[PDB]
Structure formats: structure tokens, C-alpha cells
Amino acid sequence: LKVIVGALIHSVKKLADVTILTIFCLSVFALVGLQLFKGNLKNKCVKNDPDIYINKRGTSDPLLCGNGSDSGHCPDGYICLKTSDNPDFNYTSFDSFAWAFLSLFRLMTQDSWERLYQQTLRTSGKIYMIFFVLVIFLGSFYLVNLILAVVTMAYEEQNQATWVKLKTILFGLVTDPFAELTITLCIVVNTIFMAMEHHGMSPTFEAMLQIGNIVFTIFFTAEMVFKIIAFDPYYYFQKKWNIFDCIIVTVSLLELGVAKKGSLSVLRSFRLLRVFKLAKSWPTLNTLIKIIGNSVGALGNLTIILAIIVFVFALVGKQLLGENYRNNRKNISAPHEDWPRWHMHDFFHSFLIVFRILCGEWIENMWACMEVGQKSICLILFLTVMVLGNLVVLNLFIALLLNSFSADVGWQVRKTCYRIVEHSWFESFIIFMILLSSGSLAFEDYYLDQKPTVKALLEYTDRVFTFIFVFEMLLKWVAYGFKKYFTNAWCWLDFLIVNISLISLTAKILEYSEVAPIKALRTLRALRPLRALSRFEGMRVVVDALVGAIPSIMNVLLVCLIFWLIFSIMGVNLFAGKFWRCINYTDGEFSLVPLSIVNNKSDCKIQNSTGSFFWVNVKVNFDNVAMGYLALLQVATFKGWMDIMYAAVDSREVNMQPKWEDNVYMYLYFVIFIIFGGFFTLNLFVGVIIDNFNQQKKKLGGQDIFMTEEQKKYYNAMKKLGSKKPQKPIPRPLNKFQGFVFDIVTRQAFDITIMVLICLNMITMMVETDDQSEEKTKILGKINQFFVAVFTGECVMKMFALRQYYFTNGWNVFDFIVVVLSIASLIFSAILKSLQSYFSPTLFRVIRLARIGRILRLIRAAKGIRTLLFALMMSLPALFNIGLLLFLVMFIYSIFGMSSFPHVRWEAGIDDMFNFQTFANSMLCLFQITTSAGWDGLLSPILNTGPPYCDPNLPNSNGTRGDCGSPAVGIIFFTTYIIISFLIVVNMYIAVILENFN
Ligand SMILES: *[C@@H]1O[C@H](CO)[C@@H](O[C@@H]2O[C@H](CO)[C@@H](O[C@@H]3O[C@H](CO)[C@@H](O)[C@H](O)[C@@H]3O)[C@H](O)[C@H]2NC(C)=O)[C@H](O)[C@H]1NC(C)=O
Ligand SMILES: CCCCCCCCCCCCCCCCCCOC[C@@H](O)COP(=O)(O)OCC[N+](C)(C)C
Ligand SMILES: CC(C)CCC[C@@H](C)[C@H]1CC[C@H]2[C@@H]3CC=C4C[C@@H](O)CC[C@]4(C)[C@H]3CC[C@]12C
Ligand SMILES: CC(C)CCC[C@@H](C)[C@H]1CC[C@H]2[C@@H]3CC=C4C[C@@H](O)CC[C@]4(C)[C@H]3CC[C@]12C
Ligand SMILES: CC(C)CCC[C@@H](C)[C@H]1CC[C@H]2[C@@H]3CC=C4C[C@@H](O)CC[C@]4(C)[C@H]3CC[C@]12C
Known about the structure:
Protein name: Sodium channel protein type 10 subunit alpha
GO molecular function, one term: transmembrane transporter binding
CATH architecture of the domain at 2-161: Orthogonal Bundle
Main location: membrane
Structural class: mainly alpha
CATH topology of the domain at 2-161: Helix Hairpins
Organism: Homo sapiens
Bound molecules: a molecule of 3 linked components (NAG-NAG-BMA), 1-O-octadecyl-SN-glycero-3-phosphocholine, cholesterol
Keywords: Cell membrane, Disease variant, Disulfide bond, Glycoprotein, Ion channel, Ion transport, Membrane, Phosphoprotein, Repeat, Sodium, Sodium channel, Sodium transport, Transmembrane, Transmembrane helix, Transport, Ubl conjugation, Voltage-gated channel
């Protein structure tokens, strides 16, 4: 309505600066991509002596090539020509500016950016990960922070603007506080009783569990009867807690009366909502329930707005694409499924599509839509859903976030070592030694076997490092008292790490050097580079800030763990052991045998003529509550989410072959789990951390946290450099000719002319295209010469108009640097094109990029972009500390992975490039998952258990008998990685937000 359009106009006015920054930064990075990797994602592997392309293991699209020393290779008998198609429906390469903009929008929204990351590093070269790191940090974090801050401030400004019965009663009225404690004990034990539901529970276990359920239903019924007789029912009403318990008990007894095995497992688990009764001695659970209530209560208007928006988008998508999806389904349909797992044909699946968009995965369905129907309709619909969809969601996540959180010889002997240790020389020696030790544990990799000298040198240096660190601890002991030394947290960590190293080294010589405990002990050497958190003041202050919030993290962690236990129990009840299928694993790719041939384990055993019918289960299932937790986490991070939705919907009943969309309506379980365990237990984690820092800062004096004392004054000086200090220039300097040029320069024409010159040098290098004609190349290359000459001449006339001692007058030094860079690029291109033109052709495009300075020159004109960049400049030291810590933890887990998974089957997620064998590869993978992208894909080849998936008979990997994973450690590793990184990055968002708040 008119009110809505007026509010939108006001918001865009408030969103103008951030929108302009987004468009400009996206354009700059699009130009960088279009001038770096245009025409690289076309190197389909092809045969040589013809026109058929190999496929990547378990893939339908062709493999990709690159000639770079560190790009994707190709199998023998194949050659790497370029082909007119791009890997993913001819839509995932940025050669034209349109594709560059789209791919950089994908990188910003971090939606399936894993795919582009792997493709581009496979076709271009591993060294280009720098572009993706830079774009992820700048814009995927930066621009999201700024847009979320803008909406925050918009909301803030909106707020600113706006007798046997007598004996029974006597016995019953006790209501002693010991009765409630017994009830709570009975709830807890009942829950932990039902938390032993597993697929292969024996009949005795089933009997025991149903007996327990009967006992507890009886006990609840008896307590309800006591309560109703304790006082007359007329007063029982007006008690929400009591009526909730009444309804749940009624459902429990109704299910008990049911004699069909509790066919509705949902009803079976309806009792489990009792844990909410436990929200009386816990304040965090009460706050969570209050969050949900405000969502459904005071702030229900926004929620209904979100629901109506999603319903409208789903219905429109169906009405406009169902028939096309049905007719051309074969186009997007899997090779064997004969159908698209997602489509618009039915309201349910259109809603699921819209929900996946809101979840933040849009490109897959985007390609499907825009290769099955009109491009215009798909283009507008998917993008308009992304913007409006994720805008409304973030409005909830904050509106709820604020609503809920607005309320003697010995003396001299000791002094000897004391003054020795205090020596700055020794302090620097030790810090450098720690850094060298951290570096040393990086080349111990899968390939270290083939270089005997390197490993011998590495073990020698580790031994010497152990000895020197033992000496250092001896000096520490001598200098400081035992009590003082042991009462220090950091001293404890340095004690444990040296203990681990010493015991590992002793075990090297001693026996028992192969058992699993000692193997794990030596695996813990990856904590060795954790000694550098006290040495560095930035890391130390960050660690103190984090440890300050440990209790506030733990409270919400436990509340969320209980909520996830509830959901895992429901999931186990619903899908205990139905995630089993008979497959066709002949060589590499596999397919579910059709129901015609095999219908159940019996068939899969008798129809096994070829020997290629295996009966195996999904990697992550709902057998146990542990696997319930793991699968719930995968659905919560939105990675691996799909393989489980597929298995859940397909499964029919124990020991039966899954059928396509048998239980098509079991998507609702995952929709509900997201909506409740993913978004409502994150509005409670954020809230707690912001209410923790809001106070912790207030307590420490309100001084900016994360910044060392030394850097505090450097930041003070910088913000002092960001002040108001203008000097009036001198007219007609020196000779009148200088005055003549100066008077015209002063006018408000030179600025605008250079600016419109910089815009026409942007739109002359954006019109470039990979398949451009040679005449087009000629004209644009000459326009480039004209522009560089114009800029150099118009930069040297102003220079003369201001003598030669005006470098420090202002930002003109940047203009001088960029113009000299452009001239240098011109001359170097001229040299290479003729003199020594035999170098690699990549350098031509690398250097040709140096013309981006003429784009960076537009900053000084844009006040909003300049202010936001200044905010980044101010935040840079704190972000440097946090990034140091994050790279440190990334290093720790890099060494862990390098030691753990150097032998694994290269299933979807792990291939030759993105394995864990090399340090750089492992670093690539860990950086990938730091954003929580593709961690499921990297996890799947670790859950492999025996054939057919893995080959535990393989000669290699003596630890596991073959290239089979170890899920016990593989789940801990990735769960801890995606939790720790979330913490660090959520403290990196807080820092940026508080800096921009100043
Ligand atoms: C797995 O599913 C298949 C398909 O539903 C089941 O196949 C059917 O099983 C029944 C019972 O064994 C068979 O019935 C008998 O068939 C013989 C002839 O083969 C007939 O002489 C008997 O009077 C009786 O009708 C039925 O034929 C069979 N159908 C097919 C197509 O094979 C199978 O039993 C299931 N396995 C298990 C263990 O549940
Ligand atoms: C090495 C094992 C691997 C995992 C290590 C943990 C991961 C690294 C990050 C966490 C570091 C944990 C240790 C540092 C904790 C913060 C530091 C906690 O403060 C304790 C002392 O450092 C302070 O000095 P004192 O205790 O001697 O005197 C003050 C007395 N009060 C005030 C404490 C009572
Ligand atoms: C596997 C074995 C060797 C691990 C032993 C680790 C123990 C001894 C360490 C790990 C972390 C340590 C704590 C870290 C921080 C502090 C605060 C400070 O006031 C000293 C005591 C106290 C509370 C430490 C006590 C000892 C402690 C709990
Ligand atoms: C200066 C003229 C073009 C009018 C103003 C529009 C300018 C600023 C920009 C806006 C969007 C731009 C287009 C966006 C993308 C592409 C695809 C690329 O492969 C060739 C150039 C082309 C087609 C651009 C031409 C210039 C363009 C039209
Ligand atoms: C409303 C203002 C005036 C008060 C302060 C509120 C601050 C603390 C709020 C408003 C915006 C919030 C952010 C919104 C979204 C995200 C992204 C999420 O992945 C982690 C939490 C994080 C980074 C939030 C942290 C807390 C936050 C910065």
C-alpha cells in the first residue's frame, strides 16, 4: 500500500549509501574477475588420438582442465582444449560482464560458492585463492555487516520517531516442595529412558522400554488425579502450565489405549514436550520460550507478513512454472530418477523451493528454472525472492533480538633466573622459536614419505625443540614460585603442551608406539602451535574476551542441546533404521535398483545375479540419538541437508526398498526443525552474547576491547587523522603560467571532467568480452591508450600548477601512484608483446589488471563509501587480532586434518585438488569450511564404512586397513571446526558493528 511504498522509500534513503557501496564493490570485483578468469571455465577434458568428455567420479557434468602448474590436470589419453559450454548448464563462468556480476553476487551471498571455488581453482590455478579470500572477507562479511547495521539503525530511528474427603484433602494438600522435585526427577529419568531408542533394539529391550512407558504414564495419571482431588476443579482452570500437563497426559493415555503400536510416532513423542515443565529452575529455557512467544505474540505481525510472503511466492511459482516443469521435466530430471527432486508443479514443492531460497540456496533451482522455462520469469522470481525473502527474515532475527534483550642465598639464586628471563633478547628468542615450531609442523604431510631427508630434519628439529622448551620450563620454575607458576592459566597450557610433547618423544623410543591411544596422543601434537596466544598481546586480549563469555555461552549451549535432544528423539522414533536401500555399485557411480527387480532385503539377496546389488544405508541417519544430533546439525547449518531429506522422504518401512516420494510429506519434519532449532536457538545465542559484551565492556570501563594498549594510541592517532583540518592554497604560484593553469584548475570543472572520464574508462573496459572480435579488440585497446595519455597529461598539468612539493597535500599522491602504475603497465605490455614475448600469457592479464586504480580513484568522490572505508581502517587492528587468532585455529585444525585424513576415497567433496594430502590443499579445504560450506561434502567420505563405498582391503592406509574413514574422529573434527569458527566470526561481526556504531 501507499504506507508500504513510503516506508520502502525511506528505507532506500537509509539504504542508499550501503547499496551504492555494494554495487560499486561488486562492479570492481566483477571487472577483476572478467579480466582474470574470462574463458577459463571451458576446459572440458576431451580425448585425443574425440568429441566426448570424461566425467568426474560420480558426476554427470564433465571434468575441468587447466595448464597452470597448480591447476586441474586431466587423465591420460585426454587433452584440455577449450569448449563453447560452461560447466553448469553453460551458466557458471564469468567472461561477459553479466556473468561476472552474477558470479560475484553468488560469492557475496556465499550460496554454493564452494562450487565456483573448486571450478575456478581447478581451471585457473590454486594461487588464485587470494581473490576468493579477499572477496569473502571484503563484502561477504563486510557488506553483510553494513546492510544488517543499516536495517538496525533504520529500526532504531523508527522507534525514536514513534470425613473421608477431608482426610484425602489433608493428605493431598501437602504439596510439599519435595513433590515438585520428584516430578522433575521423574521427567528427567523418563526422557533419558526414551533416549535409548535404536534401530536394532532387542525384544527384551523393547519390553523394558514399553514397561517403563506404562509405569510413567500410570504415575502421571496418578499425580493428575491427586492434583484434581487436591483441590476442586473449579479453580484448576486459568493455569496454562497445568492445562498443558493435562493435555499431554491425556495424549499419553490415549496413545496407551491405542493398540496399533502407536502408529503415529509423532503422538508417541508428543509426551516428550514435558521437558518444558523443566523450565522452572532454568531461566534460559524461560527466555527461549519468551522468544517464541514474542514471535507468535507481540511481534506476530511481522511473522504473519513473512508467512504470507512465502505463500504468495510459492503459489505464483507454481501457477507460472508447473506445466513447464512437467512437460520438460526430462531436461532437469536426474539420469535415473526420471523426475526433478524439486519443482513448482505442486503447491507443496513450490513452497519447499521458496523455503530453500529463504534458507539461502538458490542457484541450483535457478539454473533448473532458467533452463526449463522463460529466462525472464525465472530471473525476476528467484532474485526478488532472495532480496525480499532474506530482508524480511533478518527483520525478524533482530526485531526479536532487541525485544527480548532490551529490559638469603635462595632469593639471589631465584633473582638470577628472574632477570635472565626478563631479558628482552630471550623473550624475542622464545617468541621466534614458538613461531618456528608452529611453522615446522606444516610440512609433515602425506608426501613426506618420498623425501627421506626432510622427515629426518623435521624430527631432529622437533627433538631439539623439545629439549630447548624443557630448558625454558626449568628456567621458569627456577625464576617463579611453584604456586605462582601453577596458578596461571597460560602457564597451565604451556605445561600441558610440553607434557604431551615429552611423552610423545619418550614413546618414540619406548614400546607401545602403535596402539590407538598413543596414535591419538601423537595426533595431539597439532596443539603445539597453540603456545602463541600469550606471547601476542592481541591474541591474549582476544582470548580473555572470549573466556569472559564462557558461562554465557554454556548456558545457551545446554538449552539448545536439550532442544536438539527433543528433536533427535522425535527423529529416531520416526526414521529408526528405515534409511536402507539396495544399490547398483558396479564401478564408481551407483543407482538404487528399481522396485521391479528388488523390493526388499529378501529380493536384494535373491536377485543378486551379477554381484552388484549392495544393501547399504545413508551416511548420516536417525538410528541413534548421536546420529540424530549429527543429522540435526547438518540440517541446521544447511549443508548435507538434502541427502537426508531425500532418504527420509523415500524410506517406506524397515527392510524395504525406498520408493520415490513414498512419504512425500516428511519434508514438514525438517521444515519444523529448521524453523525451531535453527532460527529460534540462534536469536537466543546472539542475544546472550550481545547482552554479555554490552555489560563486560561497561564493567572494564567502556574502553574498546580486542585492542592492545599500544594499538589503542595508534588508533587514537588514526581517528585524529580522520578529522577536520583544511589549508587554503596559494593562487598564481610562482610564474603567471602556473597561475594561469591553477585558476582554471580551481574551478568546479576539472573534478567533474576527470570523474566522467573515469566513468567512461569503466564502461570501456566493462564492454569487454571473451569472444570479442579483433576489430572490437583494436578499438578498445586504442581507447585505452587515449585514456592513459589523457590522464597522465591532466595529472602532470595539475602537478605543475602546484610546483613539486605538494605530494603530502592530500589524496593526490594516490592519483600520482595510479597514473605512474598505468604508464608502467603500458610500457611493460609494449615490451612483452615484442621483446621476450615467450613468457606465460597469464602475466598479460595479471598486469592488465593494474588499470583498476583508475576505478579505485572514484572513492574520493563518494562520501558514503569513503566513510565506510574509513570505518574499516579504524577497525583494522582489532580485525587483525581476530584474524590472527582465526588463522591460528585454522592452522591447528589444518595439522589435525593433515595427520588424520591423508588416505580417503575421493567421494563428492574430496578430489585430487581439495584433499587433505598437501598443506596447501588442506588449507584450501579448511578455509572452505570456515564459512561452513561443503563441510558435509568433506564429511561424507569420512563416514564411509567397509565396502562398497570404501575399500578396507586396499593395501594402503594400514591404520584403517584401507581408504576408509574414521567417523569417531571425523565428526568431532568437523563439528568442533564449524562451532569454533562460528564463535570467532560472530566476535568479528560484533567488533565491526561496534566500530561502525561509534
Ligand atoms: C518383497 O516384496 C516382494 C514384492 O511385493 C514380495 O514378493 C511376493 O512375495 C509373495 C510371498 O512370498 C509371493 O507369493 C507367492 O508367490 C508364489 C509364486 O511365486 C505363489 O505360488 C504363492 O501362492 C504366493 O502367491 C509373491 O509371488 C511375490 N511376488 C513376486 C513378484 O515375487 C516378497 O515376498 C517380499 N519379501 C519379503 C521377505 O517381504
Ligand atoms: C593446550 C590445550 C589445548 C586447548 C587450550 C585452550 C585454547 C586456547 C584459548 C584458551 C586459553 C585458556 C587459558 C587462559 C584463560 C584466561 C586467563 C584466566 O586467568 C587466569 C590467569 O591467567 C590470571 O592470573 P592468575 O590466575 O595467576 O591471577 C589472577 C587470579 N584470578 C583473577 C584469575 C582469579
Ligand atoms: C590431561 C591433563 C594433564 C590435563 C590437566 C589440565 C588441568 C590441570 C588444567 C587445565 C586448565 C587449568 C585451569 C586454567 C585456568 C585457571 C585459572 C588460574 O587461577 C589457575 C587455575 C585454573 C582454574 C587452572 C587449573 C588447572 C587446569 C584445570
Ligand atoms: C554508456 C551507455 C552504454 C549507457 C549507460 C549504461 C552503462 C553505464 C552500462 C550499464 C550496464 C552495462 C552493460 C552490462 C553488461 C554488459 C555485458 C558485457 O559482456 C558487454 C557490455 C555490457 C552490455 C555493458 C555495457 C555498458 C552498460 C550498458
Ligand atoms: C540495535 C542496536 C542499537 C543494539 C546492538 C545490537 C547488536 C549487538 C546486534 C544487531 C545486529 C546483530 C547481528 C545480526 C546478525 C548477525 C549474523 C549472525 O550470523 C551472527 C550474529 C550477528 C553478527 C548479530 C550480532 C548482534 C548484532 C550486531
